[PDB]
Structure formats: structure tokens, C-alpha cells
Amino acid sequence: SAAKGTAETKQEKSFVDWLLGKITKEDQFYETDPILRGGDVKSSGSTSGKKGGTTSGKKGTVSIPSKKKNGNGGVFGGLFAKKD
């Protein structure tokens, strides 16, 4: 008892479109939650300490050989490698 009709239809150009959007969230991608400053009181971030025991390790100008006399040797590769 029916055939065809008005399937395509949608006209929302009023304040209601924006108003109703406030009730149904209608958010985009705001995660920071800009309510005032950020919504995070936090506490701290410096309880640990490494101290400056040493002030010199690998300059990269006078330390290194700047030529590498060795290199032909090496059976595995991770035998004389340092990376503490």
C-alpha cells in the first residue's frame, strides 16, 4: 500500500541544532576537558634524584679516535660492545 517517497530529507539550520547538541554531547575530540585551566591539580614530579656525580663522559671530538683504526676484526659483533 505504498511506493517510493521522500527518503532524502534533513534541514537543521536553527539554534536548536546547536542547543540540542549541548544536551547530546555532540563533542568533537576534546579530551583535555577545557573547564578552566585544564582540570588537573597534579601533585609533584621530582621525588627521585640522579645527582651530578660526573661531568664528563663522551665529548665526541677529542675522545673518539676520529678514524677508527680497528674494524676488520669481529667474530660476533656484541662482544666488545658497551651500552650499560
Q: Is 26 left (phi over 0), alpha (psi -120 to 50) or beta?
A: left
Count of residues making up the chain: 84
Determination technique for this PDB entry? NMR
Q: Which residues contact 26 (CB under 8 A, 6 or more apart)?
A: 20
Grid coordinates representing 65 are 679516535
Backbone angles phi, psi at 27, to 5 degrees: -65, 170
